[PDB]
Every structure is written in C-alpha cells, then in structure tokens.
Amino acid sequence: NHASAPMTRAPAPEYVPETPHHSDWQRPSFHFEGKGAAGGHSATRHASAPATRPQ
Amino acid sequence: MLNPIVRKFQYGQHTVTLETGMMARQATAAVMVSMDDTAVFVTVVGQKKAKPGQDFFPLTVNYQERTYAAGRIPGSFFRREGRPSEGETLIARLIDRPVRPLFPEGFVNEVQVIATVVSVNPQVNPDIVAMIGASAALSLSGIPFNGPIGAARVGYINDQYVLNPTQDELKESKLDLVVAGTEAAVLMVESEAELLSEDTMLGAVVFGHEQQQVVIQAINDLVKEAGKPRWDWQPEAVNDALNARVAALAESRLSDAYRITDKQERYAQVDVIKSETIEQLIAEDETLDANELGEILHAIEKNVVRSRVLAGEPRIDGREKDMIRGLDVRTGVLPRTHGSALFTRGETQALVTATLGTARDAQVLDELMGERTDSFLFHYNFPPYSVGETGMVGSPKRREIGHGRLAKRGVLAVMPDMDKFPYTVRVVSEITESNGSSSMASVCGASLALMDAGVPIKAAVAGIAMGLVKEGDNYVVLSDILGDEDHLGDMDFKVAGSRDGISALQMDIKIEGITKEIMQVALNQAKGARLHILGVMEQAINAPRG
Amino acid sequence: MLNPIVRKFQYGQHTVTLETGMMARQATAAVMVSMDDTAVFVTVVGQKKAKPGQDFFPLTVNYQERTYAAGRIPGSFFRREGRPSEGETLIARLIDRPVRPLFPEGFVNEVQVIATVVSVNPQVNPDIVAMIGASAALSLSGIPFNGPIGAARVGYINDQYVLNPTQDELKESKLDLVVAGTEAAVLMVESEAELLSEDTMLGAVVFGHEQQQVVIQAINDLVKEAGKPRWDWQPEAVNDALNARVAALAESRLSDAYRITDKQERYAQVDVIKSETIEQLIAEDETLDANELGEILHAIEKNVVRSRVLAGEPRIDGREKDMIRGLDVRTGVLPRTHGSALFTRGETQALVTATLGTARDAQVLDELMGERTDSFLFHYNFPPYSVGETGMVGSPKRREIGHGRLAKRGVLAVMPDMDKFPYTVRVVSEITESNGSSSMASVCGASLALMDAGVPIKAAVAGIAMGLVKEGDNYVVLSDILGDEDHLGDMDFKVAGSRDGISALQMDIKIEGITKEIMQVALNQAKGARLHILGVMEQAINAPR
Amino acid sequence: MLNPIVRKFQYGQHTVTLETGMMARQATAAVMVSMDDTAVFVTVVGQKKAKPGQDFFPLTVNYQERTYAAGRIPGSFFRREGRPSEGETLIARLIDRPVRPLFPEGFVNEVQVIATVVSVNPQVNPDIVAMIGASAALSLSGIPFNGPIGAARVGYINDQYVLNPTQDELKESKLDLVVAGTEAAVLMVESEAELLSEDTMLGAVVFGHEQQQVVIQAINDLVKEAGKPRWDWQPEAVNDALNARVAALAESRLSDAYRITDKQERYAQVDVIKSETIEQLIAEDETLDANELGEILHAIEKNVVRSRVLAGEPRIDGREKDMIRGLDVRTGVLPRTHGSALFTRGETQALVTATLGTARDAQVLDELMGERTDSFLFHYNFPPYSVGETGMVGSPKRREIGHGRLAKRGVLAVMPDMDKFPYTVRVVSEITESNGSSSMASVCGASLALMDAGVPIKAAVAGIAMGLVKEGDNYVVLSDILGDEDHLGDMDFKVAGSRDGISALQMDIKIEGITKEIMQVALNQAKGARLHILGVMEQAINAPR
C-alpha cells in the first residue's frame, strides 16, 4: 500500500573484514584454433608495384 | 475549363506525350510526361531572388515512385510510401548529374525539381521518362537553363544497338547504357556491360546521343508554344581591377611554389603567399573582405595547376599524365571473414570483405516494376576518417550510394550464374583512405575478396578513374586522378572491367568539343591503366581459393 | 611501400596483436587490435584548431558492429547494418566514460574515436578489445591525452576471480565487472553481480586493475616506437586579474549567502551578489562579456560549496554527509497495469510499471555473440518535464540507455529463474522528477512494481547514488548526492543491491589517490543507505502480491 | 511525506477523478485524470521568459500512448514504442486546436504540454481524458490562459444524443462528434457522421457543450483550491503614435488600391505604397526597423480587407460571399491506375487515385483499445510546389495528417459495406495546387476516383471550406474561403457530405458570440455550396464505372 519516512541519517554499519574464500578450482585452458591476428601483416597473399607508367 | 497543351512524338518504338498547363500552375513549371503508359509528373520551382551570401548552387532533385502507379497497395507496416529508397536516390542522381552543369556560372538561386511516378507500364522503365520530364520542365520554366537535354537507354542485343529496351529485351541484352546529352555534346554516361570492348561502348554512347535528338527537338517545340518568358537574371559583376591586382601580386609566386618538388614545403609556401597577400591587400584597403580574396587566390591556384598540366609539366604529386600511383594488394587480412582484402592505390585504400550466405539471405526488393530477388549485395561505407575529418557515421550520403552502385556495376559482370554458385554473396567495402576514386579501389578490392572467399568469378576486375583537361584544341588525359585534381576534370570518367572487356563505364562531361576520337584516346589510356592494375592484382591472387 | 608496425603481447589466456602504420593513414591515429580472432579497427581524428567560442569538449565515440565479422548476412529488410543498436551505444558509452577525463583541462578541440568490429570470435567479447584499441589510438595520435588506459572484464567462478571470462564461462559466473584505469588509478567500473559482498566487488576492481597493466605497458611500448609527435597545445592562460577581482567582490558575500538555510532566500541573495558584482566590476572593465563573469562567479560559488562540505558544514540542502532525503513509497497507483509503483526520494520521483506477457513477447536480439532471447525488458523514460524544462519527447538521448541498463543490472540478480516464472516481464520506468539519481529510483520502483505485479523475486533491491569529495588526505563521502552537487564528485558511485548483496556497481573516478580503504569506507556508507531505503520499502510491501 | 489533492465528479455515466500535487512537482503543473480506469497523466511546463526574438507563440502538444496501459508488451521489433503514430498526432491536434486560441495575444513564451496515457479501460477512449487533463494542467499552472475548457464526445443512437459513447455503443451510433469549448462559447468541433442533417449536427454541438459544463466547473473548483498564482505577464505596449502615423500615411492609399479589380495591378500598387511609406518613415526616423513597420502595414491591410468584406464589398478576388470558384472535373487521367480523377476549384487542385486490393492487404493497426483491421486507407500528400515554394519532400507535417484524416472522415460515410464490396481500397490524394482548402478538394477527388475505379459507393460526396467574419452584431458568411483570407475567419468550418446529409464537420471558432442561429445560417450556405459542387461533379462521372 503506502509507506513513508522523514529525512534520516543512515550511518554506515559496523565493518567486519571478510576472510577471502579459497578454492582449488583450476580454470581450464582456452583452446584457440585460428590465425589470431588481423591487419595487413597477416595477409596470406601480397603483391605490390611502385608508381609506374602503364606500358 | 482548364486548357492542357499536349504534344505527342515518336521515340523509337514508343510514343511520348508531354502535357503542360493544367496540373500545377503555381509552380515555375510542371509537365506530365508519358511513354506508352508510364507517366511521371515533373515539377520545377525556382526562387526568383538569391539569398544574401550564397556561394554554391543549391539544386535539389527528388524522385518518387508511387506504389499505386503499379496498381498495388504498399506492403510496409504502415502501408504507405516511406523514405526515398536506394533506387529512388539513384534515379534522382541520374537526373541531377546531367542538369547541374547546365546552369550558368554565378547562378545561386534555389531550384527544386520533383519527379513523381504516377503510372507504370511494367515493360517501360520510368527513369528515362523522368529525365525527359525534368528536361522539359526546366526548359519550360524560363530559369536560365543552358539547353534542353535528352536521354536514352541503349542495349546490345544480337550484336546490334537497341533504343530503350524493355525489361524483357533487357534480360537478354549484354549492355545497359544510359546516355544523357544536349544537341551538341554528351553530358552523362552511366552504363553496365558484360565485358564489352571500348569501341562497342563508344558506339553505344554515340547511338544514344543521336537517338535522343527527337526528344530535344520536341522539347524545343513545346518551349516554343508553352514556355514562360525567360528570366531577367544577370551574373554578378566581375571585379576586373581587383582580379588583375591579385594576379599581378600572387600569380608568379604561386607558379613558383608549384614549380618546386616537395608537397609539404609547397603547401606551406602556398599558404604563406596567401596570408601575405591577403594581409597586404586588407592593409591597403580594409573594405575588401578576406574570404573573397581567399576565393580569388584559390581560383588563381587552380588556374596555375591547369596551365602547368596543359603545358606538359608534372602534376601536383610529381607524376606524369599516364603514371598510376603505387599499389599494394593484401588478401586474408581479417581472420574470421569468409573473404577479405586490402587494396591501396597511393593514398586511397579500401578494406573489402565477402560473405557467403544461403538462399534465404537474398534481398527481396518490391520495386515499382515488380518483385526482384537479389542474390548479390554490395555495400559501400565511406567513413569520415577516410579524409581526415570528423563527422557523422552510419548516415550514407547520396554520392556514397551512387558510388556503391557504380562499384556493384563494375563487379556484377563477372559474378557466376546461379546454377554454378547458388549461394548468396554480400560484399562490403570500407574506404579506409580516400585521395582519389574510392569506388574503383572498391571494385578491385571486391574482386580480390571474392577470389579470397572462394567465389568462382569469370575473371578479375579492376577500375581506373581518369580525367581529361581541355583548352581549345589542346587536351591532356590524366590517369589515376587525385582528389585535389577534381577541378581539372573537363571530362571525368571511371572505367571498370577485366583483361578482355569493360564492365562499367561512367562519364560526366561538362564542356563541349569532346569528339569520338578524344574518347578513343581516353579509353585506350584507361585500358592501359586497368591492365597494369590487373597485372599487379594477379601477381597476388590469380584464382579462387580452394 | 606499406610497412606495418605489429606488437604482440600475452593478456591472460589470450594473445593481443596491435597493428599500426598501414591502414587509415589520413587519420590522426589508427590501430587494428586483435585478441584471439576478435579484431576491432579503431581510428581517432582530432581537429587541430578549436571552434572560436567553444566551452565544452566535443568528444564523440562511435562503436560499430559489422555482421560480416561473424560470417553472416544482416537479417534486416535492407540486409545492411543500420543505426546504432542499444548495445553499440552502450559499448561506445563504456569507451567514452574512461577517456573523457584524461584529456587536459581546457582542451576543447573536436575529437572523434570510431571503433569498428571487423572480426569476431564467438567466445571473445569485442568490447574490451575496442577499449584497448581506443586507448592505443588515443595514445599514438599525439592529441593531448593523459595516459594509456587499460581494460579488463573480471568474473567470479568457484569463489575465484577470472580475467576476461569467455562467453561459456560467463554463464557459471557470479560477476560481470568491467574495470578501466591508468597505471595509477581506476577510472571506471561498470558491473553486474548476483548479490555479492562489497569486499568481493572491490577485490575484483583491484584484480582487474592489477591485471590490465600489461596492456598499459604494451601500449606504452607501441607509443615509444610508432607515436606521432605530441601536439603543441597550450591552455589559455587564466585571467588571474579578472578572477581575483571577482573574488574580492563576491567570494565573501557568497560564502555568507551559503550560510542561509531557506532555499529560496539563499538562491535570491546569490543572484543579487551575482548581478551586483557583475556591474560593480563591468563599470571599470568597460565592455567585459557577461557569460565570462558568470563563469568566474559559478567557479567561485562551486569552490565555496566544496570548501564548506570538506570543512564539515551542512550540505546545500542542510543535510549531513550520511543523511538520506525523505522517502515516499506507493504501490498499485495505476488501475489497469499488472504492477505499478511510485517511488519518491526527496525530489527524484519515478513511476514504474511491470507487465507480464508470454514467452513469445520476449525480445529476440541478433547479436555478434550469437542469437539470444531476452525474457526481461527494462525501458527507461526521462521526459523533459522531470527537470522543469521544455524539450523533445520520445528521444532516448538523455542518457536513458545507460541509466536503463544500470537499472536493469540492478534488478536482474533477484529476477526468478525461467523454470519458476516462465513469463516475459517488461518493466517501464517513467522519471517524473529528477534532482539526484533517477537510475536508482528506477531500481527501487522496479522492485516495488515487480512485487506488486506478483512476480516472485528472490529479494527486494534498492539503489543509492553517492559521491566522494577529496582535497589531499581529507575526504568526505556524501549519501544521496543531488543533481546540483555533481561538481562535488571526485568519485561518483552508484550501488544497487538487496539486503544481503550488491547487484550492480558503477564508479566514475576523476581524481587520483583513491585507495582501497577509501573505497571500502565509501561502499560501507552506501550499505547503510541501501539498508535504510530497503527498510522503508519493506514497510510498504514485503512479499509479492 | 506527499499528499495529493483528489477531486471526483460524475461526468455522464462515468466518474472522473482529478489528482494533483504529488507527481511531477518540478513542472509548471501536472494532473492525473482518470475516467473509469482510463488514466492519463498530463504535464505542462511554461518558460517564464520569452526568447528575445519571437514572433509566434511556441506551443507544443505531445500525446503519447504507452502499451503497458493496456497490459500488453509492444509488438514492435525493439519491444518499445518509438515513433508517434498517426492517431497520436491526431489526438495532439485535438488538444492543440482548442487551447492555442485561448492564450492571451502577444504571449510568445514557450509552452509544452505532454499527455501520457498510463492506463486504458478498453471502453473509455483516452482522448477526451487527455483534453480534460490538458485543460486542468493549463488552468492550474498559472500561465496566462483564458478559462478552463471542457470536452465531450457525442453519438447518435436510436435518434438520441449519447454523451461519451463507449466503444461498443459507437458501433451502433451514426455520429462521432468531439466538441471542446469554454463556459460561454464552443471553440472546436470535429465530427464524422453517417449522412445526417445539419440540425442533427448542430444539436449535438449544443448538447456536448451543455454537458461539458460539469467538467469546466470541476476544473474551476480544483484551480480554486490548488491553483498556483497567476503569472505577472503583461502584454508589450503598442506604439500608438507609430501606429497612427503609419495609418495616416498608408490607410487611405491601401483602401483605394484595393478597389482595383485586377490582381496583379493591385498587388503592384500595394507593394509601391508599402515601400514608399517605409522609405519615408525611415527618412523621418532612422531608428525605425523594417520588419516592425512592415508588420504594421500588413495589419492595416488585413483591417482594410476585413472592413471591405463586412461592408458588403467584393472580396479580394472579386467574388461575393456566396460565389464558389470555377470548377473543373476530369476523370480517367492516369493510364494504369485503377481509378483516377483531377479536381480543380479555382486555384486549388488535387489529383486523387483509388487502388483496389485483396482483403489481406488491409492495414492492421495494433492500438491500445484493441487490434483493428482497416480496409479503407486514405493518404494525403501536400508537396512544396502546391504553394509555389521549395522545401523538404516526403515528410508529412501535423496538418497534412489532420487534413488527410478529415478527408477520410468525409469519404467514410459512403464507402460500401464489406459484404457488398469485400476488397481493400486505398485512396491517395496529391495536392497539386493550394489556394484554399485542399482537404475538401481531396474529398471530391476521392469521390470521383472511387466511382472511376468501380467502387459501389452509396452517393457522391463533396466538401466546402467556409469562414465567418463577425464584428459585434454584423456578420458575413464567406463560401469557398481562399488561402489568403485565413485572417478573415472568426469561425472556420469545413463541411463534407452528400446531397442528403453531412459526413464530416470541422469547426474552429476564435471569437465569442457565435450562437446556434448564426451556425444555422452558415450551415445552410455550406449546404447550398456543396449541392452546387455536387451538381458540377455529377455532370461528369454520375455513377460508378
């Protein structure tokens, strides 16, 4: 239904440091099959010609 | 009772009717053109007074296809014609290209041409009717239009030229050329061919120019009987004394700036010559605004370049008239795309990709002339950083749409038939650098990416953008025109094709005097340029990937 | 010829390749970044001259996704990628948040960063790759930019932090946190969690900042070998004269005007000081632009407010650092909606509705990672009248996308599983008033409306927007920050969650020196604020209707 | 901490609730109006300072419909409502038309009204609720506004008037009329009838106006209790001296120039008189600006035309009050359309086409009230060249959507029933010339095109737009009003119908004193004009093809 509250100071609650939970889980390795790289350096076939006057 | 003025004439195998004086009488001119049941209402409104401080001609051409013309209700969710489609934008540029150069220098009044398709005979294409209607309306308006233009579509059936082939004839035709011109000169050529020779394409341009003279004559008669009185427009006064002052001050300096062989140094020196001249002139007389002096210096720089080129001197980048810029071809640049290539020609670069899909991926276009299934898709993106500028991305300007259709036309001639490659192919071009013709680098990159993707194409295709500069009898053909040499294009043409024929030809002539021999010399220099590019392309990849 | 500069480094379980020098050579900088087959081409163009009379920094980040990257043809009617999707706008906002504060103060030249995805590995998300590419392009450009940034996505699987979790691993994960920062400080944290503690969420921010340093070092080596000469840009020197002038004439008056309690009286007197000081100076300074004097005054004012807050004095509304504004909670406010609620915090009010539909009504998104169906929809509307202004309605460009994703991220953790509630839920939030964080009022209203609609949620969630102001080793954490105290946010953070955990955390730091202890104190005061808001919300509705 | 002021009253068979004071407290005013579970939230924001250069009043009305109001998730691809629909733009004009004439003259401060539908009872239409919420929000805001307006929808069932007919009752009703007015005068009428008389259509306006008084009285009580204090807006003083000087210089000359019976010669001499008065005044006083004197001249010209019309002098084109412009009817113009017609009335001309399709081609509209299949589509296109200007092409404004809905309303009464004609019909009208009312030319062209296409329509329909000029006791009813006589229309009304009844009636009164006896004379003249146009039309097509 309905509820309201005035302007109230909500103080920070008492802080208890947390012990970090520990696990021996081993993250499996990532298997990647591919070239891995993009850009010109990865080109499978390349050709060039300087500025020339068509014969 | 409304009195319509109707003029009928025979255009090839069709009858064209021009009707004026009844439909839109509050517009500067209005004409209803019909060719064998395909009708386009074309209107022209020209503002009589130019807005103060206008620098460029503001001409707008809007082409609309109305679904009811085909006796059909629109199939969109709102069942109403929406924003201009690609086809409509392209037909609007096909109309805009021939007419823009025919308004006189200094005409900066606003002109809007609106062509609306109101009836369609499935066999008669509305684009030629719309161009004829725009020519008739512009000539009837009394606006300073420098002459009626005509238009024709030429096909190549049984080794013969045919005028305005119907869609059925066009299915068996090896050529689809649209030529537009005046009584004296060809002004526009947008074409697509199945690897035809240069002589065939030039004969087709001549044939269409010869056959559109009946349209030109009929428009002249209509103007002689129903044309409005001509406009009392005079170009703004040219300051001969100021032009002489600026020339005598900066012309020989800029000439010398250009006679040095370093691009960055030159650019600097040039700017210097300017800043110095403008400061000195405004100090002598503060009345003259800076901007006008800057425009006059820019124009003097353009004339200096033009005269250096015409005199046989090297171009702005040190190249001779027939030299192509440096070429780098790389295929396989992207890891997870079916096919990819990077094509660099000097300072113009394109990253082109090819993707293979299934028959469900073909685009179904419901066009005014019928439903059509497109298994080959071409998309061209021209990002702002291609030119070192900031701007808006995604939004495709109209030229960028026209450049993607020109590249698709260039590549379409070598795509395999559906019984040998029943797959859907999408080719996406990304212009990464642009100092020249990005559409032709898109053609070469599309060919490389299609070969990389394993699509069996008939042959590799490349394109070349050329330009012809003419002063009287003297002319020079320039290969691989630069983006800064756009002012030197009395005739700017773009030829695409393979080692054995032409697949796409676009021409935009703005001057008069270009004979057929001149077109022989220009298309022979473009053949040499394209064959050189094709050799460099073949040295990388020569056959589709297994 | 074309000679590419390629640098490869190991980032966790992936290899990152940075290539520059051969593509888009007419742009200020351009880099192709590839991580395990996911490749993004990022280009930065900066204009060399500033538009005369420019006040704000024009920075645009455009993120584009290409369907050909995934080997697919677009499914739209035109078979072409179109206007930015909501995901593209959100990733571009995640590239803009960490870079904008790293440009020098005064720099107002126009900069556009365009990142285009060109290849995608269904397992590797292109967003961190695009962030690495933006950092590299902005560090190779020479444009005044204060540091290579890194980027990392942390996940939490089997009570362990995992760097850049893959799409398969992000299913069993309890966290999806993105942390970007420089070598010295964290600058941005965007996260979504399944009700985790404040210590698990901060340990994640630390883990990802420590792990992104290899990216920072790689970009610093690439810049050492291929960077463009640094721009010779200098900030316009301050008119120290006009400044100290305006000070002498208005500082003490404003410092006393701010001791006034009544809002209306305070606002009036300030304009009296503002107008009077303007003329009483303009008289001798002949023609001095007004806008300029108004700026100098705003500066003075904001500095008075800062000094007061840092000195321990009441805030501009009379509140103390830990006080939350008045709360009003109503449910069932609309007759024919499945669920509705009105949430009011001070002067920020949100009208939130929840609608139930069939599995069919669920949104099908075709994404680069793969086709995906979303059964929970969150739509946020920020109308122009919320701030008492006129404007264009229906344009979700008032940061509605970002604020609607932060609210969705706040409510997703408590949403029921599909095998308990196999219905499509659409939550629409209307921001009726705004003078604070509306994104967090939307989280509390979404929780109330979902309980009203009968949706069985795991727990009620609420959110609070906080801020931290620091001057040296002195700092104050302010709860329920108002829209006026935006300038007081050296660290502006927003934390949503339930009574037993955080469900979303957004942080945007603009300064340096915020350690882990400071963030712990800041997020402990944000716990006290949520638990108060949550107790007020539970007094209205405790269980779904 | 929040307390809303709620007032309930009985409006016919419904209970209307007005709620203010709780939601959207940063807007100038906000009201939630509920009519039997149909709730619309309406907000108004007015800027308290006028822009420095402002000639027109910047009023914007935005009406948005939210799908959650009907308990449904939107069927759009993005599961959001993004673009305003046609019905939304037409409800915004129904709200805009009655209120714009009620803001004081010279008031040019920007005002935005936003009406959002937040709950829908499928049987109570949200448009009347939106109009009542806009009247309440504008009367509570304090913004200079003249009186609360009310609204009512009347229907004709069993030869009796029904107030606010429900969606079911509207199936059996022969009328659908919306009347909005103040306490003393009707201001807006929009209606669609099934070929009813003029007495039956004026009785409904009088009934709806007498029934809306409970709404105006409840809004007045709500404003009395919760209204904000009226603004201190004073109209800018008129330059009485400059006025009288321009009047002495040019009034006689223009009054004599207008007795010329040639359009071009009169226009040239008027331009001369204007230029000369301007030049001379500028020579006398160098401070005078051109646009102010030009506007004073234009106002003097309008007053001259009004005085000539009210004295019985011929109109600006030589016609008397009861003469209709020359008519030209042409059928079968387009070669391949199913039906086509060109209709010309003087300088207004419309090319209309009709296309027949199958049942499947009918438009499906997913609306808040419920899904609706429309087998009759009417599309209206007003190109820039119709008035001889250049502009954007392809984008319909808010008028080109209301002018098309008015023409659809005028043609809808004669459309054949589904059993007799089981086809989908689309009528597209292109306005080729505009010097008057293009909507009524669209009505006549739609009728001629429908007969040309073979659609078995019940009877031929035609429309006439007319105006009424009033000065005290003296009034003149002008038939076939021109596009340059718009200033002369104290009451502007467009009547469409057949030879035996009215199919649509739109009125827009901007003065007070228009009693039903003056409306009977106006509608009788409109009937005579429409029968003349229908006689001319019948001499061509005569019957369906």
Three-class HEC string of B336-367: CCCEEEEEEECCEEEEEEEEEECHHHCEEEEE
Residue matched to tokens 């603004």? D231
Of C22, C166, C327, the CB nearest to A40: C22
* Residue B54 parent element (H or E): none
Task: For chain A, positions 11-50, list CB contacts with chain B under 8 A.
Answer: 34-40, 42-50
Q: CB under 8 Å to C479, separation ≥6 — which residues?
A: A10, C321, C322, C323, C324, C464, C466, C525, C526, C528, C529
Q: Which is nearest to B467 in space by CA: B475, B477, B458?
A: B477
Asked if residue C246 lies in contact with residue C294, where contact means CB atoms within 8 angstroms, the answer is: no
Instruction: Judge: A6–D2 Cβ closer than 8 Å, yes or no.
Output: no
b/e per residue, C283-297, with b = 16+ CB within 10 A?
eeeeebeeeebeebb
Asked if residue C451 lies in contact with residue C460, where contact means CB atoms within 8 angstroms, the answer is: yes
Residue C484 touches partner D, C-beta closer than 8 Å: no
**What sections of B338-473 are H helices per DSSP?**
398-412, 438-452
Q: In angstroms, rounded to a whole number, what is the distance separating the alpha carbons of residues D503 and D492?
A: 17
Cα C65 to its chain centre, rounded Å, is 21
Catalogue the E-assigned strands of B197-336. 327-331
- CB < 8 Å & 24+ apart, contacts of B313-320: B313/B259, B315/B478, B315/B482, B315/B485, B316/B258, B316/B482, B316/B484, B316/B485, B317/B263, B317/B482, B318/B261, B319/A51, B319/B480, B320/A53
Of B326, B332, B529, the CB nearest to A45: B332
What CATH number matches the domain at D240-310, 1.20.1740.10, 1.10.10.10, 3.50.50.60, 1.10.10.400?
1.10.10.400
Q: Which amino acid is at D7?
A: R
* Residue D21 parent element (H or E): none
- Which of D15, D40, D45, D228 best probes binding to C when mutated, by most C CB atoms within 10 angstroms? D45
Quote the crossing angle between the two packed helices D438-453 and D399-411, to the nearest 10°.
50
SS3 label, residue D231 = coil
Beta partners for D344?
Answer: D328, D349
Phi, psi dihedral angles at D452 (to 5 degrees): -65, -30
Q: Which fold has domain B327-540?
A: Ribosomal Protein S5; domain 2 (3.30.230)
Domain with CATH 3.30.230.70 in chain B: 5-226, 327-540
* Chain C nearest-CA residue for B425: C73
Asked if residue B265 lies in contact with residue B271, where contact means CB atoms within 8 angstroms, the answer is: no
SS3 label, residue D71 = coil
Of C1, C327, C331, the CB nearest to A4: C327
Q: Which amino acid is at B413?
A: A
The burial class, CB within 10 Å (0-12 / 13-18 / 19+), for C511 is middle
Q: Which is nearest to C190 in space by CA: C454, C408, C431, C500?
A: C408
Instruction: Judge: A34–B336 Cβ closer than 8 Å, yes or no.
Output: yes
Instruction: Judge: B69–D336 Cβ closer than 8 Å, yes or no.
Output: yes
Q: In what order do the strands lie in the sheet with C376-381?
A: A2-5, C327-331, C339-345, C348-357, C424-433, C376-381
Asked if residue B80 lies in contact with residue B74, where contact means CB atoms within 8 angstroms, the answer is: yes
Residue C400 touches partner D, C-beta closer than 8 Å: no
Superfamily covering domain B5-226: GHMP Kinase, N-terminal domain (3.30.230.70)
Asked if residue D222 lies in contact with residue D5, where contact means CB atoms within 8 angstroms, the answer is: yes
Residue C92 touches partner B, C-beta closer than 8 Å: no
Q: CB under 8 Å to A16, separation ≥6 — which residues?
A: none
Instruction: Judge: B62–D394 Cβ closer than 8 Å, yes or no.
Output: yes
SS3 label, residue D498 = coil
Q: Which is nearest to D376 in space by CA: D434, D427, D336?
A: D427
**3-class SS letters over D265-321:** HHHHHHHHHHHHHHHHHHHHCCCCCHHHHHHHHHHHHHHHHHHHHHCCCCCCCCCCC
Instruction: Judge: B73–D357 Cβ closer than 8 Å, yes or no.
Output: yes
- In sign, the C-alpha dihedral spanning D259, D263, D267, D269 is negative
Catalogue the E-assigned strands of D303-460. 327-331, 339-345, 348-357, 363-366, 371-374, 376-381, 424-433
Phi, psi dihedral angles at B176 (to 5 degrees): -140, 90
Instruction: Judge: A54–B528 Cβ closer than 8 Å, yes or no.
Output: yes
Residue B75 touches partner C, C-beta closer than 8 Å: no
Cα C344 to its chain centre, rounded Å, is 23
* Chain A nearest-CA residue for D3: A4
Q: In angstroms, rounded to a whole number, what is the distance separating the alpha carbons of residues D156 and B5?
A: 50
Beta partners for D351?
Answer: D342, D430
The burial class, CB within 10 Å (0-12 / 13-18 / 19+), for D367 is middle
Q: In angstroms, rounded to a whole number, what is the distance separating the alpha carbons of residues B154 and B145?
A: 26
What is the DSSP-derived secondary structure letter of residue D413? Answer: G
The burial class, CB within 10 Å (0-12 / 13-18 / 19+), for C542 is exposed
Q: In angstroms, rounded to a whole number, what is the distance separating the alpha carbons of residues B443 and C185?
A: 48
Asked if residue D64 lies in contact with residue D84, where contact means CB atoms within 8 angstroms, the answer is: yes
Alpha carbon of A1: minimum distance to chain D alpha carbons (Å): 14
Chains touching chain D through at least 3 C-beta pairs below 8 angstroms are A, B, C
* Chain B nearest-CA residue for C35: B335
Q: In angstroms, rounded to a whole number, what is the distance separating the alpha carbons of residues D526 and D513?
A: 20
b/e per residue, B18-50, with b = 16+ CB within 10 A?
bbbbbbbbbbbbbbbbbbbbbbbbbbbbbbeeb
Asked if residue B528 lies in contact with residue A54, where contact means CB atoms within 8 angstroms, the answer is: yes
Domain with CATH 1.10.10.400 in chain D: 240-310
Asked if residue B313 lies in contact with residue A43, where contact means CB atoms within 8 angstroms, the answer is: no
D11: which 2 tokens? 């409006």
Please check if D486 is assigned to a binding site. yes
**What sections of B419-480 are H helices per DSSP?**
438-452
Q: Which is nearest to B301 in space by CA: B488, B463, B442?
A: B488
* Number of helical (H) and strand (E) elements in chain D, helices listed first: 10, 21
Asked if residue C457 lies in contact with residue C444, where contact means CB atoms within 8 angstroms, the answer is: no
Q: Which is nearest to C444 in space by CA: C354, C340, C534, C380?
A: C534
Alpha carbon of B422: minimum distance to chain C alpha carbons (Å): 15
Domain made up of D327-538: CATH architecture: 2-Layer Sandwich (3.30)
- CB < 8 Å & 24+ apart, contacts of D203-206: D203/D161, D204/D154, D204/D156, D204/D161, D204/D175, D204/D177, D204/D179, D205/D154, D205/D177, D205/D179, D205/D507, D205/D516, D205/D519, D206/D516
Alpha carbon of A47: minimum distance to chain C alpha carbons (Å): 11
Task: For chain B, positions 172-201, list CB contacts with chain C under 8 A.
Answer: none
Residue matched to tokens 């537009």? B180
Please check if D492 is assigned to a binding site. yes
How many C-alpha atoms does B368 have within 13 Å on its Cβ side? 31
How many C-alpha atoms does B483 have within 13 Å on its Cβ side? 13
* Chain B: residues touching A (Cβ < 8 Å): 319-320, 322-336, 342, 346, 452, 479, 525, 528-529, 531-532, 535-537, 539-541
Q: In angstroms, rounded to a whole number, what is the distance separating the alpha carbons of residues B71 and B369?
A: 11
What CATH number matches the domain at C240-311, 1.10.4080.10, 3.40.50.300, 2.60.40.10, 1.10.10.400?
1.10.10.400
Asked if residue C164 lies in contact with residue A27, where contact means CB atoms within 8 angstroms, the answer is: no
Of B324, B329, B452, the CB nearest to A52: B324
A42: which 2 tokens? 């990865």
C189: which 2 tokens? 């944290």
Q: In angstroms, rounded to a whole number, what is the distance separating the alpha carbons of residues D349 and B25?
A: 9
B77: which 2 tokens? 């969710």
Q: In angstroms, rounded to a whole number, what is the distance separating the alpha carbons of residues C320 and C314?
A: 5
Q: In angstroms, rounded to a whole number, what is the distance separating the alpha carbons of residues C90 and C100?
A: 15
Of C335, C379, C391, the CB nearest to D39: C335
